[PDB]
Design an enzyme around this catalytic site. Sequence first.
Site, PDB file in Angstrom:
ATOM      1  N   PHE A  33      14.498  -4.572  33.676  1.00  0.00           N
ATOM      2  CA  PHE A  33      15.957  -3.918  33.244  1.00  0.00           C
ATOM      3  C   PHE A  33      16.007  -3.372  34.447  1.00  0.00           C
ATOM      4  O   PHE A  33      17.145  -4.077  35.452  1.00  0.00           O
ATOM      5  CB  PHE A  33      15.592  -4.210  32.062  1.00  0.00           C
ATOM      6  CG  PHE A  33      16.967  -3.753  31.291  1.00  0.00           C
ATOM      7  CD1 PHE A  33      18.085  -4.789  31.932  1.00  0.00           C
ATOM      8  CD2 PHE A  33      16.623  -2.887  30.361  1.00  0.00           C
ATOM      9  CE1 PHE A  33      19.561  -3.985  31.416  1.00  0.00           C
ATOM     10  CE2 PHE A  33      18.263  -2.511  30.147  1.00  0.00           C
ATOM     11  CZ  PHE A  33      19.301  -2.867  30.188  1.00  0.00           C
ATOM     12  N   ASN A  55       4.361  -5.701  39.691  1.00  0.00           N
ATOM     13  CA  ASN A  55       3.423  -7.022  39.251  1.00  0.00           C
ATOM     14  C   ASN A  55       4.023  -8.083  38.689  1.00  0.00           C
ATOM     15  O   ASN A  55       2.969  -9.383  38.011  1.00  0.00           O
ATOM     16  CB  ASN A  55       1.868  -5.965  39.059  1.00  0.00           C
ATOM     17  CG  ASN A  55       2.348  -5.553  37.450  1.00  0.00           C
ATOM     18  OD1 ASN A  55       3.900  -5.760  36.668  1.00  0.00           O
ATOM     19  ND2 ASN A  55       1.137  -6.215  36.376  1.00  0.00           N
ATOM     20  N   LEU A  56       5.168  -8.286  38.343  1.00  0.00           N
ATOM     21  CA  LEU A  56       5.525  -9.443  37.436  1.00  0.00           C
ATOM     22  C   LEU A  56       4.937  -9.564  36.008  1.00  0.00           C
ATOM     23  O   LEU A  56       5.127 -10.888  35.838  1.00  0.00           O
ATOM     24  CB  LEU A  56       5.718  -9.998  38.750  1.00  0.00           C
ATOM     25  CG  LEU A  56       5.957  -9.766  39.984  1.00  0.00           C
ATOM     26  CD1 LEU A  56       6.001 -11.602  40.243  1.00  0.00           C
ATOM     27  CD2 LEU A  56       7.957  -9.357  39.957  1.00  0.00           C
ATOM     28  N   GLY A  86       9.079  -8.866  34.586  1.00  0.00           N
ATOM     29  CA  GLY A  86       9.544  -8.473  35.233  1.00  0.00           C
ATOM     30  C   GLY A  86       9.956 -10.033  35.915  1.00  0.00           C
ATOM     31  O   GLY A  86       9.150 -10.881  35.621  1.00  0.00           O
ATOM     32  N   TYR A 128       2.726   4.945  22.685  1.00  0.00           N
ATOM     33  CA  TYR A 128       4.121   5.300  23.226  1.00  0.00           C
ATOM     34  C   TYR A 128       4.711   6.030  23.805  1.00  0.00           C
ATOM     35  O   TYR A 128       4.417   6.944  25.679  1.00  0.00           O
ATOM     36  CB  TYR A 128       4.843   4.251  23.798  1.00  0.00           C
ATOM     37  CG  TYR A 128       5.875   3.619  24.734  1.00  0.00           C
ATOM     38  CD1 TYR A 128       5.385   2.326  25.090  1.00  0.00           C
ATOM     39  CD2 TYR A 128       6.543   3.859  25.509  1.00  0.00           C
ATOM     40  CE1 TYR A 128       5.792   1.696  26.343  1.00  0.00           C
ATOM     41  CE2 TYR A 128       7.332   3.059  26.632  1.00  0.00           C
ATOM     42  CZ  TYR A 128       6.815   1.938  26.947  1.00  0.00           C
ATOM     43  OH  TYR A 128       6.866   1.671  28.357  1.00  0.00           O
ATOM     44  N   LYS A 142       3.644   8.687  27.780  1.00  0.00           N
ATOM     45  CA  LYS A 142       4.514   8.625  28.222  1.00  0.00           C
ATOM     46  C   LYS A 142       4.683  10.919  28.583  1.00  0.00           C
ATOM     47  O   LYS A 142       5.525  11.138  29.731  1.00  0.00           O
ATOM     48  CB  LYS A 142       6.229   8.615  28.208  1.00  0.00           C
ATOM     49  CG  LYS A 142       6.221   6.719  27.824  1.00  0.00           C
ATOM     50  CD  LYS A 142       6.542   6.916  29.725  1.00  0.00           C
ATOM     51  CE  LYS A 142       7.362   5.993  29.676  1.00  0.00           C
ATOM     52  NZ  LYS A 142       7.557   5.198  31.404  1.00  0.00           N
ATOM     53  N   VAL A 201      17.765  -5.932  18.479  1.00  0.00           N
ATOM     54  CA  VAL A 201      18.198  -6.172  17.218  1.00  0.00           C
ATOM     55  C   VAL A 201      19.581  -7.150  17.426  1.00  0.00           C
ATOM     56  O   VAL A 201      19.966  -8.238  17.125  1.00  0.00           O
ATOM     57  CB  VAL A 201      19.462  -4.879  17.120  1.00  0.00           C
ATOM     58  CG1 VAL A 201      20.401  -5.417  15.400  1.00  0.00           C
ATOM     59  CG2 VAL A 201      18.565  -3.551  15.969  1.00  0.00           C
ATOM     60  N   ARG A 250      27.587 -16.565   7.094  1.00  0.00           N
ATOM     61  CA  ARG A 250      27.159 -15.891   5.724  1.00  0.00           C
ATOM     62  C   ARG A 250      26.436 -14.736   5.510  1.00  0.00           C
ATOM     63  O   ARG A 250      25.310 -14.712   6.419  1.00  0.00           O
ATOM     64  CB  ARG A 250      27.198 -16.397   4.505  1.00  0.00           C
ATOM     65  CG  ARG A 250      26.116 -17.491   4.734  1.00  0.00           C
ATOM     66  CD  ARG A 250      26.139 -18.668   3.475  1.00  0.00           C
ATOM     67  NE  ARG A 250      25.688 -18.059   2.207  1.00  0.00           N
ATOM     68  CZ  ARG A 250      25.551 -19.520   1.430  1.00  0.00           C
ATOM     69  NH1 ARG A 250      25.734 -20.712   1.530  1.00  0.00           N
ATOM     70  NH2 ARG A 250      24.970 -18.965   0.404  1.00  0.00           N
TER      71      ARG A 250
HETATM   72  N1  NAD Z   1      14.665  -0.848  27.934  1.00  0.00           N
HETATM   73  C1  NAD Z   1      14.698   0.282  26.532  1.00  0.00           C
HETATM   74  O1  NAD Z   1      15.534   0.290  25.723  1.00  0.00           O
HETATM   75  C2  NAD Z   1      13.968   2.304  27.680  1.00  0.00           C
HETATM   76  C3  NAD Z   1      14.213   2.518  26.565  1.00  0.00           C
HETATM   77  C4  NAD Z   1      13.526   4.009  26.662  1.00  0.00           C
HETATM   78  C5  NAD Z   1      12.119   4.307  28.228  1.00  0.00           C
HETATM   79  N2  NAD Z   1      12.290   2.821  28.764  1.00  0.00           N
HETATM   80  C6  NAD Z   1      11.525   2.901  30.053  1.00  0.00           C
HETATM   81  O2  NAD Z   1      11.855   2.694  31.381  1.00  0.00           O
HETATM   82  C7  NAD Z   1      11.365   2.003  31.992  1.00  0.00           C
HETATM   83  C8  NAD Z   1      11.938   0.268  32.663  1.00  0.00           C
HETATM   84  O3  NAD Z   1      12.095  -0.035  30.679  1.00  0.00           O
HETATM   85  P1  NAD Z   1      12.533  -1.220  31.415  1.00  0.00           P
HETATM   86  O4  NAD Z   1      13.302  -1.994  29.472  1.00  0.00           O
HETATM   87  O5  NAD Z   1      13.246  -1.843  32.322  1.00  0.00           O
HETATM   88  O6  NAD Z   1      10.975  -2.638  31.479  1.00  0.00           O
HETATM   89  P2  NAD Z   1      10.825  -3.804  31.774  1.00  0.00           P
HETATM   90  O7  NAD Z   1       9.320  -4.648  31.371  1.00  0.00           O
HETATM   91  O8  NAD Z   1      11.928  -4.542  31.769  1.00  0.00           O
HETATM   92  O9  NAD Z   1      10.089  -2.838  33.734  1.00  0.00           O
HETATM   93  C9  NAD Z   1       9.329  -2.536  33.598  1.00  0.00           C
HETATM   94  C10 NAD Z   1       8.101  -3.320  34.791  1.00  0.00           C
HETATM   95  O10 NAD Z   1       7.442  -2.826  35.039  1.00  0.00           O
HETATM   96  C11 NAD Z   1       6.585  -3.862  35.750  1.00  0.00           C
HETATM   97  N3  NAD Z   1       5.287  -2.632  35.508  1.00  0.00           N
HETATM   98  C12 NAD Z   1       4.915  -2.579  34.741  1.00  0.00           C
HETATM   99  N4  NAD Z   1       2.674  -2.385  34.660  1.00  0.00           N
HETATM  100  C13 NAD Z   1       2.782  -2.317  36.093  1.00  0.00           C
HETATM  101  C14 NAD Z   1       1.955  -2.575  36.602  1.00  0.00           C
HETATM  102  N5  NAD Z   1       0.598  -2.078  36.550  1.00  0.00           N
HETATM  103  N6  NAD Z   1       2.439  -2.444  37.959  1.00  0.00           N
HETATM  104  C15 NAD Z   1       3.204  -2.105  38.691  1.00  0.00           C
HETATM  105  N7  NAD Z   1       3.852  -3.109  37.376  1.00  0.00           N
HETATM  106  C16 NAD Z   1       3.839  -2.938  37.270  1.00  0.00           C
HETATM  107  C17 NAD Z   1       6.852  -4.321  35.055  1.00  0.00           C
HETATM  108  O11 NAD Z   1       6.573  -5.953  35.380  1.00  0.00           O
HETATM  109  C18 NAD Z   1       8.607  -4.470  34.944  1.00  0.00           C
HETATM  110  O12 NAD Z   1       9.159  -6.054  35.098  1.00  0.00           O
HETATM  111  C19 NAD Z   1      10.254   2.143  31.394  1.00  0.00           C
HETATM  112  O13 NAD Z   1       8.930   3.287  32.106  1.00  0.00           O
HETATM  113  C20 NAD Z   1      10.350   2.464  29.999  1.00  0.00           C
HETATM  114  O14 NAD Z   1       9.202   3.118  29.167  1.00  0.00           O
HETATM  115  C21 NAD Z   1      12.825   1.756  28.715  1.00  0.00           C
END
Ligand code: NAD
Lengths: 290, 290
Positions: free
Chosen positions: A10, A30-31, A34, A135, A139, A174, A250
């Site tokens: 995202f 690593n998708l 994603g 989490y 972080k 939500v 409703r």
């Molecule tokens: N979306 C939110 O509301 C939100 C809020 C706070 C913090 N974040 C942070 O923002 C970042 C992105 O969040 P997001 O919502 O886009 O999530 P997401 O899951 O869409 O994106 C994370 C991507 O990381 C890749 N990934 C995960 N582990 C991996 C690994 N070991 N090797 C390679 N790729 C790997 C996944 O395939 C994925 O495409 C994260 O670090 C998350 O903690 C997001």
Amino acid sequence: LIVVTGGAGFIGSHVVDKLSESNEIVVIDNLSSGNEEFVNEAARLVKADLAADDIKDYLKGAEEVWHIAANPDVRGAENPDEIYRNNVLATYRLLEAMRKAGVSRIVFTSTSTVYGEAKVIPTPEDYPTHPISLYGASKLACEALIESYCHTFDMQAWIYRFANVIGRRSTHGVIYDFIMKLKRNPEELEILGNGEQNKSYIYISDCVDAMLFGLRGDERVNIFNIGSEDQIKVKRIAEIVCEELGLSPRFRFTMLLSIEKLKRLGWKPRYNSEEAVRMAVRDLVEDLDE
Amino acid sequence: LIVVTGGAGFIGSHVVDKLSESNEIVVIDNLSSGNEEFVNEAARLVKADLAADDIKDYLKGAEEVWHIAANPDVRGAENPDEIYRNNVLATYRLLEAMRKAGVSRIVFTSTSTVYGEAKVIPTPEDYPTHPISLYGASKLACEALIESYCHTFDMQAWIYRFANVIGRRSTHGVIYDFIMKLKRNPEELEILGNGEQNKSYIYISDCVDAMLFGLRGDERVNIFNIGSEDQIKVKRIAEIVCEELGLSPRFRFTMLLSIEKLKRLGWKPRYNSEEAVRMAVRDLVEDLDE
Ligand SMILES: NC(=O)c1ccc[n+]([C@@H]2O[C@H](COP(=O)([O-])OP(=O)(O)OC[C@H]3O[C@@H](n4cnc5c(N)ncnc54)[C@H](O)[C@@H]3O)[C@@H](O)[C@H]2O)c1
Ligand SMILES: NC(=O)c1ccc[n+]([C@@H]2O[C@H](COP(=O)([O-])OP(=O)(O)OC[C@H]3O[C@@H](n4cnc5c(N)ncnc54)[C@H](O)[C@@H]3O)[C@@H](O)[C@H]2O)c1
């Protein structure tokens, strides 16, 4: 030449779209959660696991790394091992890769939950960090490692903390739960609680814009909160969802961060919570079909 | 029934000696920097690597765990992988093992370096934690993980931050180096810089007594700084080493934590820095014989 870990997810895919316009982009993903279809065609996709595969060769010549990859943060039914692996270990391995390859710039997406049970809202960046969730702790652990690598191996960092980002390509929360309910039954929407519960959302474009803007920060380590100027009640979210879907069901009833630091620097979100929600509902609708 | 990781080491052995007087002790140690001979005979020694072995049979029925095990904090000559594995990973795996075995009390030795470049001295526990060293960052990461496990899996913790603990069984430090160099040329001692550097030292018994005392803290997560009331100069250390060795070489010249929180609780260190140093020197001379 910029490397974007998690560039197929995202927030990451949005970052890629914006940077690809004037930078050579290499994405490492690593998708696991994603979608490769989200990756801009102007970028190179390397399918690798940050926690197990060597990546220094993919960082060769890179000037900056946007570390956006991580485990999905879920409610409860969380798995300690995947959070540790994809957040802590992955980040440690990335830092070592950066060290060996000579990359000294890192932009990191942390999270609002590093503040734990904060007793002052809106929460400023200098508020104590005593996370209560795994989490959040993972972080904060990542931030600590980044900070130390910055001072020990001479790197510079920009750390962004934020809570809920919404917009095209995201699918949960939500808004999602409401859509899936009204798809199930367009004449009734269940709302947990009395709907008076508050929420705050940052639109994806503002999330990206803030991260880009904060880069003007020139401390060795720059920490910034990203967020919207306001809140919105769950009750209003439901209505907006009904409004965009053109429904009248409703209704069945059963961590704000301060952005003053970024604002005194010169940044301001273009959208408020209601606007973020309305635009996000429209794009999620089409997203689920597409 | 108490488990003490790192019980074959400096601080850990002393903890075991003290706790074995009234508790059944299980020591888990990989005898890396620790010595089997330091383990109290009343304790059960389990040779294992926290970062690699199955320690479930060992935590069975334990009431609490004193997590003293960790990588040696060295000078510029540190091994990131070793610090990561023996501090961060070992701690994560321990918390998981504790969770699985039903052990929910943890006593942890962190470090004063979680504070990085403290601008407020004496440094209080509420001072911001932005570590500049990988060691400090690894410990802060451990703290975060412990705090989240306490809240997520119903555990209680006591975290102690301190530096420069000296006394019998320790072989790292200014005193050891002075004695070693003096053992070469007893008529000329090289002291870095003008040796006016102030340094607060805590004698091993005060470190151990402070940790036991702090258990009175009844928050879910209790964080306490440990240390002595004063400081002592490097030059002064050299003097005391000579005073005790009965040597008169010529000197060839090449942070303080606040303990008010523990003091408010009723604890007071018995020895000041000069006293800890004087006792430690004699302890080492005798240690080198054994
Ligand atoms: N979306 C939110 O509301 C939100 C809020 C706070 C913090 N974040 C942070 O923002 C970042 C992105 O969040 P997001 O919502 O886009 O999530 P997401 O899951 O869409 O994106 C994370 C991507 O990381 C890749 N990934 C995960 N582990 C991996 C690994 N070991 N090797 C390679 N790729 C790997 C996944 O395939 C994925 O495409 C994260 O670090 C998350 O903690 C997001
Ligand atoms: N001594 C000091 O001045 C000081 C200052 C600050 C913090 N500390 C902290 O206090 C604690 C104890 O320090 P110490 O001075 O006694 O050091 P130490 O090296 O003597 O003791 C550590 C013990 O850990 C064991 N160990 C290491 N890795 C292990 C693994 N993977 N599995 C099992 N056992 C393992 C070693 O065999 C050793 O006996 C550490 O957590 C340290 O970071 C000490």
